Structures are given as C-alpha cells and as structure tokens.
Design an enzyme around this catalytic site. Structure first.
Site, mmCIF file in Angstrom:
data_model
loop_
_atom_site.group_PDB
_atom_site.id
_atom_site.type_symbol
_atom_site.label_atom_id
_atom_site.label_comp_id
_atom_site.label_asym_id
_atom_site.label_seq_id
_atom_site.Cartn_x
_atom_site.Cartn_y
_atom_site.Cartn_z
ATOM 1 N N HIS A 98 58.948 67.642 30.601
ATOM 2 C CA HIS A 98 57.526 67.447 30.323
ATOM 3 C C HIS A 98 56.594 68.410 31.082
ATOM 4 O O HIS A 98 55.386 68.314 30.935
ATOM 5 C CB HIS A 98 57.105 65.994 30.579
ATOM 6 C CG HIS A 98 56.108 65.476 29.590
ATOM 7 N ND1 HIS A 98 55.902 64.131 29.390
ATOM 8 C CD2 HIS A 98 55.283 66.115 28.729
ATOM 9 C CE1 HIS A 98 54.987 63.961 28.454
ATOM 10 N NE2 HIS A 98 54.599 65.150 28.031
ATOM 11 N N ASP A 124 54.452 57.904 27.595
ATOM 12 C CA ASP A 124 55.320 58.255 28.730
ATOM 13 C C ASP A 124 55.513 57.053 29.674
ATOM 14 O O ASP A 124 54.661 56.171 29.713
ATOM 15 C CB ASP A 124 54.693 59.443 29.496
ATOM 16 C CG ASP A 124 55.702 60.237 30.311
ATOM 17 O OD1 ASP A 124 56.617 59.618 30.927
ATOM 18 O OD2 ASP A 124 55.562 61.481 30.347
ATOM 19 N N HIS A 126 55.713 57.771 32.862
ATOM 20 C CA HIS A 126 55.004 58.384 33.945
ATOM 21 C C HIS A 126 53.675 59.012 33.586
ATOM 22 O O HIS A 126 53.549 59.571 32.529
ATOM 23 C CB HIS A 126 55.839 59.535 34.418
ATOM 24 C CG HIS A 126 57.266 59.192 34.632
ATOM 25 N ND1 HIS A 126 58.241 59.446 33.698
ATOM 26 C CD2 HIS A 126 57.890 58.639 35.689
ATOM 27 C CE1 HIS A 126 59.403 59.056 34.173
ATOM 28 N NE2 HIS A 126 59.217 58.572 35.382
ATOM 29 N N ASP A 128 52.439 61.654 35.074
ATOM 30 C CA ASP A 128 52.573 63.088 35.326
ATOM 31 C C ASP A 128 51.287 63.708 35.867
ATOM 32 O O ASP A 128 50.834 64.760 35.407
ATOM 33 C CB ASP A 128 53.019 63.821 34.066
ATOM 34 C CG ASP A 128 54.380 63.384 33.586
ATOM 35 O OD1 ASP A 128 55.192 62.895 34.397
ATOM 36 O OD2 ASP A 128 54.642 63.539 32.383
ATOM 37 N N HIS A 141 57.574 68.828 36.315
ATOM 38 C CA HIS A 141 57.393 67.939 35.147
ATOM 39 C C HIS A 141 56.627 66.637 35.435
ATOM 40 O O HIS A 141 56.256 65.925 34.497
ATOM 41 C CB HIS A 141 58.732 67.672 34.425
ATOM 42 C CG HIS A 141 59.561 66.580 35.016
ATOM 43 N ND1 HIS A 141 60.484 65.874 34.271
ATOM 44 C CD2 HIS A 141 59.632 66.079 36.267
ATOM 45 C CE1 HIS A 141 61.086 64.984 35.039
ATOM 46 N NE2 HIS A 141 60.577 65.082 36.252
ATOM 47 N N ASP A 225 56.872 61.565 25.408
ATOM 48 C CA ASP A 225 57.999 61.564 26.337
ATOM 49 C C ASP A 225 58.863 60.444 25.781
ATOM 50 O O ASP A 225 58.383 59.356 25.594
ATOM 51 C CB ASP A 225 57.506 61.155 27.747
ATOM 52 C CG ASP A 225 58.437 61.577 28.909
ATOM 53 O OD1 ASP A 225 59.695 61.571 28.732
ATOM 54 O OD2 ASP A 225 57.964 61.856 30.008
ATOM 55 N N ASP A 227 61.155 58.832 27.247
ATOM 56 C CA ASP A 227 61.398 57.801 28.265
ATOM 57 C C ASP A 227 60.260 56.792 28.419
ATOM 58 O O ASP A 227 60.395 55.831 29.158
ATOM 59 C CB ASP A 227 61.888 58.391 29.598
ATOM 60 C CG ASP A 227 60.788 58.900 30.487
ATOM 61 O OD1 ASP A 227 59.886 58.124 30.902
ATOM 62 O OD2 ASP A 227 60.856 60.107 30.820
ATOM 63 N N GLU A 270 61.821 65.544 26.899
ATOM 64 C CA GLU A 270 62.742 64.892 27.848
ATOM 65 C C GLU A 270 63.987 64.277 27.214
ATOM 66 O O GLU A 270 64.528 63.297 27.753
ATOM 67 C CB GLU A 270 62.031 63.826 28.730
ATOM 68 C CG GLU A 270 60.910 64.304 29.654
ATOM 69 C CD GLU A 270 61.369 65.144 30.830
ATOM 70 O OE1 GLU A 270 62.596 65.348 31.031
ATOM 71 O OE2 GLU A 270 60.471 65.616 31.565
HETATM 72 N N1 LIG Z 1 57.994 62.795 34.781
HETATM 73 C C1 LIG Z 1 58.702 62.163 35.905
HETATM 74 C C2 LIG Z 1 57.785 61.995 37.121
HETATM 75 C C3 LIG Z 1 58.591 61.372 38.270
HETATM 76 C C4 LIG Z 1 57.837 61.452 39.604
HETATM 77 N N2 LIG Z 1 56.474 60.907 39.483
HETATM 78 C C5 LIG Z 1 57.847 62.903 40.122
HETATM 79 O O1 LIG Z 1 56.760 63.517 40.229
HETATM 80 O O2 LIG Z 1 58.966 63.372 40.394
HETATM 81 MN MN LIG Z 2 56.533 62.967 31.246
HETATM 82 MN MN LIG Z 3 58.417 60.162 31.468
#
Ligand SMILES: NCCC[C@H](N)C(=O)O
Ligand SMILES: [Mn+2]
Ligand SMILES: [Mn+2]
Ligand SMILES: NCCC[C@H](N)C(=O)O
Ligand SMILES: [Mn+2]
Ligand SMILES: [Mn+2]
Lengths: 294, 293
Positions: A98, A124, A126, A128, A141, A225, A227, A270
């Site tokens: 991502h 998503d 997350h 991000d 990502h 995403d 996930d 992803e």
């Molecule tokens: N897209 C996954 C994000 C996971 C976590 N917040 C990170 O910054 O690693």
């Molecule tokens: Mn993402």
């Molecule tokens: Mn995600």
C-alpha cells in the site's frame, strides 16, 4: 457498466514492507482470470507495467525502509496515471503493497486541474497515517496517506503535486490504529467507519456517508487494501487483522462503489500470493467483479 | 528478452465457428491463466489488449457458420489496420485458423496498396480448401484460399486486395487435401513439409524464408500449434502425427522473431477443453522463443 477502455496498471512493489511475494500480486491475479474479468467491462485494456526495482531489501532498523524504491515507483506510477487517467473510463491499479497509494493519489491529483476536489475512500485495516518518526516498523506502506496530506519526509511528500487534506479521506474498516494515526483521526476529524462501526450501522449507511460526503467533489478515488476484509476470507496478505469486514459486506461495498459516477480509479493492494494463493486470489477477484457489477 | 518494444498489441480472438469442436474460443482466456500476460511483460511495459467480439449464435453444408467467420474477420481486419505498427509487435491469439483470413486482411489493410506482404504459414494443413472441395465445410480449412481470392465472395471480399500464392511459405504441412495439393503444385507454392524439415534441418527453412521475403515489405507469421508434433501439442482439434518437434518449433520461433520484417503473429488452434496444461505450457514456450526468452 461498460467502458471504451480500462487502463490496467500493474504495480509490482514489495519495498513498502518486508515480506516477499506481494510484488507478484498482479501476475497471480492474472493466472486466476483477472484479464477475463476486464474483458466483461471493456473491449480495450491498456496495461502498463510499472518497473519492478531489483535491489536487495534492507531489513534492519530504519525509520523508512527502501525509500529509493518506494520513491522511484510512486514517481513512475504518478506520471503514468497522469497520462492515462480519464473521467469517461476506469483506471485500475493492482499492487503491490500500500506504499503505492501515494503514487496513485498523486497521479489522480496530477491528472486534474489544481482546483479539482479529489475524494479518497480508503478501505483498509490500517489508516496508513504513520510517519518515519512515529512508525513502529519503518515500513513505508504504513505512511502513504500521511505523505499525501504532507506529513512525512520530503522525498515522498514532494511526489504530490499539491497535498490532499484530511477532510478528503473516508476510512472504511480501519481497526489496527497506531498512536500517531489515532492523533490524526481525532485531531483532523477524519471521517471513518471502523470494522466494528460497519458491523453496527450496516454497509448501506457507509455508502450513503460516502455519497453525501463527496457530493461537491470532482472525482473519487478508491484505495482498496484486501486486509480490510476479514482474514477468514483473505489470508494472502502480509498484515492480516481480525474482526474485519465480511466478504459479503466487501462485495456489497464494491458493488455500490462501482455505481458512483465520480469513481474513475481504483487500487487493489496487498495481495501476497506467496503467503496464500487460491482462496485469497479468488476472493479478491469476486471483489473486483462486484466493482464492475459482474 | 531478447527484443524490447514500446508496446505489444494483443488481440484476443475467441473464434470457434471455423470448425465444430467447442473450447478453441477459450484459447486466449486459458493462455492468460498460464501466464501469457507475464510473458508480454518481459517484452514491453505497455500492452494494448483488444478483444474481438465473440459471436454467441448456435453452431450450425459447404461453408459452416459463414456469418460468424465473416463478422469476426471483418472486426479483426479493421482492428489490426488501426493497431498494426512496423516498430512494435501485434500478437493475435485464436481461436481457430479461420481468423488467419482476418489477420492477413488486417496486415494488408494497414500497409499501402503497393506493399508486398509475405506470409509464413506454420501448420499441419495448408488451409487452401474452398467450399466446393472441402471435406468438412469447416471454414478454418479455407482462410488462405480466401486470401488469394479462391472462395466465396463474402470471405474473399474481406481482403482489401488479394495476396498471391508466391507470397506464401508453408512450414510443417503434412495433411493435404486433393484440392490443396492442386494449388501447391499448380501455383508452385514454396513449402517445407514436416518430413522436409526433418531431412533439411530447420536452419535451412529459415534461410529459405529470409531469402524469399528479401524483396517484401512485411512478413506475417500464422502459427497453428498443430504444425507441432502431437507428443507436445494435444489441445488442438485436428492433431496430425510426424509433425515438427518442439525443439524445432522453438528454434523456428527464435529465428522468426529475429526477422526485421516480422511485426505480426497469429497463435491459433489451442483448444484447452481438449487438453490444457501440457499444451498450454508448450504454446507459451513457443511464444517466449518468438520474443527470445
Ligand atoms: N499498512 C500496515 C501498517 C502497519 C503499521 N501501522 C506500520 O506502520 O507498520
Ligand atoms: Mn494499507
Ligand atoms: Mn491494511
Ligand atoms: N484446419 C484443419 C483443416 C482440415 C481439413 N483440411 C478440412 O478442410 O476440413
Ligand atoms: Mn490451420
Ligand atoms: Mn492445422
């Protein structure tokens, strides 16, 4: 419904995270009949492949990992999208992790005039919205949407011709939220339905909230995403997270997103088929089909 | 690669109506499952895929499903005329060999009328039957006859102008009908049979192709997978023994790909409903060899 063409951008990007194989998501969606899905929607498909970087992954302690590779790919992606984006047709980006979402939102912004109001639906687990300084992983990502609003290092934020703002973002299915991402969601009042919110209110009301929010915008961009979807159905992904959006709700979501006049661009991101191939691969394609209404 | 291009035009042609057996219309779809797009990804960063509309009328004399073979070859010719490019590569994936009329028509339509278009026709069959002398009434046995102006009006008229017998180089032909044999002897059509290929060696087929089209503007390659021996190619409707070995087919494609004049290729008669994996993979090895992979 039908389009004159579909622009298909393959984006083989693993460098936004650590796990190998997410670069092969486009290739693997192609084995499972992605092209044949697009064949139901347009007689023309202009595929572009964004160049895969082939440098070793740096895997130690770093606040932003493989910046060179995420930079180079997002620049090429932005530029390709700027040339190929079209409000009469559909552009579909297949990732790749991502960290490409910076490149994709950059491209849509670059295609429009500076006064254009670009809305972003970000489906998503997350948000991000991490920066190199507050990131637990240093995986770029997790940072892209922060980069798009101008929070992040210069080499990524400058990929945006100009920044989008927090009020342009609609989060769907977010659950795994870091402390710095939570700050941005409360501080900037960023519209969102968590996975739990989606369950309680029903995905119908997510769509009404998307439609009412982007009424005065020019275009909507969907960054999807996989996930965000529950791991029962989506295993082939590097960072799975429980209590996600059901497959049923994800197909209804894509169905109703696809029917939005403003929607002309979509990232599907992803999918790591080296983690899990067939179950995940097929469910991703059901979501993509629902988007086109097949 | 091998060779890089700015783009590759990929025309999917889901045509079964040139013969009787179902499933050859799904050749493009099935080559895509086995990684065809990823092969093209080694050659160009851009792929413009066009899908030629699949007719959806029931399968039905001397020329079977003329309407469907007409409509598809017209659309195919017209698409190719717009997309053909001497600096890039156009690849047609069939579909049965009744599309070869459409594909040669397209190449001819893309060039100026004074252009000399050469045709290498790698196949077990010459496909020079006419409705009157055809044992089957399967239009896929007729396209190259149609291209030289032998055949019914609705097919021959798809050619802007006709090619001639002296423009054809046959490779691997073995199953030859009486009317097709008449044309090969009468028109002195250059050819290496499967047996000839074995004896002389596929190196000398290439020198014969190169020396023959020296005065021509472009070459078009129409590659029927059943020109290859059935040991390696089973997913095809009309397999024929004593064909060209896979080894020779890969050397052939390798050396064809290196011809400056070659800008267009048909890959035809893959029926994955007959046989999928073995055939599918070997087709892709031939296609990779063409690009020099
Ligand atoms: N897209 C996954 C994000 C996971 C976590 N917040 C990170 O910054 O690693
Ligand atoms: Mn993402
Ligand atoms: Mn995600
Ligand atoms: N493409 C297969 C051709 C078979 C036979 N010569 C026929 O015309 O029926
Ligand atoms: Mn043939
Ligand atoms: Mn044949």
């Amino acid at each position: 419904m039908q389009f004159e063409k579909v622009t298909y951008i393959a984006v083989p990007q693993k460098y936004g995270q650590k796990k190998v194989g997410v670069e092969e998501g486009p290739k693997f969606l192609e084995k499972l009949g992605f092209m044949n899905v697009l064949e139901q929607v347009a007689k023309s498909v202009n595929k572009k492949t964004i160049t895969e970087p082939k440098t070793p992954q740096e895997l130690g302690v770093t606040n932003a990992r493989n910046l060179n590779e995420v930079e180079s790919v997002n620049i090429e992606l932005r530029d390709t999208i700027a040339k190929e984006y079209d409000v009469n047709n559909l552009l579909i980006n297949i990732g790749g992790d991502h960290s490409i979402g910076l490149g994709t939102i950059a491209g849509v912004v670059k295609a429009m005039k500076p006064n254009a109001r670009v809305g972003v639906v970000w489906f998503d687990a997350h948000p991000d919205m991490n920066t190199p300084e507050n990131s637990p992983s240093g995986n770029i990502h997790g940072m892209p949407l922060a980069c798009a609003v101008g929070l992040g290092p210069q080499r990524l934020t400058s990929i945006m011709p100009h920044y989008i703002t927090p009020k342009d973002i609609m989060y769907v299915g977010i659950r795994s939220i870091d402390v710095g991402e939570q700050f941005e969601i409360q501080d900037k009042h960023i519209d969102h339905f968590t996975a739990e919110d989606v369950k309680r209110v029903g995905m119908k009301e997510v769509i009404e909230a998307i439609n009412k929010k982007f009424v005065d915008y020019d275009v909507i961009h969907l960054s999807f995403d996989i996930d965000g979807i529950d791991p029962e159905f989506i295993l082939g992904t590097g960072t799975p997270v429980p209590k996600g959006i059901s497959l049923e709700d994800s197909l209804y979501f894509m169905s109703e997103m696809g029917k939005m006049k403003k929607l002309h661009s979509v990232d599907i991101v992803e999918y790591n088929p080296k983690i899990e191939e067939e179950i995940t691969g097929k469910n991703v394609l059901k979501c993509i089909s629902s988007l086109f209404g097949i």
